[PDB]
Amino acid sequence: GEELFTGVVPILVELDGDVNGHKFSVSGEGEGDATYGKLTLKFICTTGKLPVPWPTLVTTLVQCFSRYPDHMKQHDFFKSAMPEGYVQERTISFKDDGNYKTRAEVKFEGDTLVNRIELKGIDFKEDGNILGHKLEYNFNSGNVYITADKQKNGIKANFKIRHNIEDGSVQLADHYQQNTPIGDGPVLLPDNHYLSTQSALSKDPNEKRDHMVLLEFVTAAGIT
Ligand SMILES: [Zn+2]
Ligand SMILES: [Zn+2]
Ligand SMILES: [Zn+2]
Ligand SMILES: [Zn+2]
Secondary structure: OHHHHOOOEEEEEEEEEEEOOEEEEEEEEEEEEHHHOEEEEEEEEOOOOOOOOHHHHOOOOOHHHOEOOHHHHHHOHHHHOOOOOEEEEEEEEEOOOOEEEEEEEEEEEOOEEEEEEEEEEEOOOOOOOOOOOOEOOOOOOEEEEEEEEHHHOEEEEEEEEEEEEOOOOEEEEEEEEEEEEOOOOOOOOOOOEEEEEEEEEEOOOOOOOOEEEEEEEEEEEOOO
16 A cells, blocks of 8 residues: 555545534645655635634544655555555544544545545533634644554554643643554554654635645654
């Protein structure tokens, strides 16, 4: 699967979500260049106004574009599952608030890497930082800690995202993640390691739709 990522790969993202009964959809398009751990995407809410803050969707909205250093190539599960793909499931628990449960299939459709997601959010506070839109439009750098899940022929990840609240505080979003291959072939089961991420959120000045432009760089580290 790593062979599929030596060049620039078009990406499509499609999400359907329901947060406390507020249904919405997001479509994204862009490209990835895993050689450089680089992603550039534009996401649009196709149903109107997004009912949650864009930063809370960043992690849900293709870790196969991570740059794995040559010395860690044997630990890249994500590319090894391609093209048939993988299922990526998360529970994202927002401290003192609700949670998202996500299910995604990440796979090739022809030359395009597609991330198709269903998101369900429950138990959110109408006056909280998420439904109340009190989060800043930015995204902090962080680490994603990966371990093998041999019994499921996949991986698990754990990490904490810290969303900045407008008043100066932070909204923690605890992430628990499981990935399992869709095809019945072999994959790479990694040693413990992490992914180091940085992300820049912007706007398209001519876009009147509710949207997010995202530039992300991700690099694997942790094994020498
Ligand atoms: Zn609504
Ligand atoms: Zn990301
Ligand atoms: Zn505000
Ligand atoms: Zn601030």
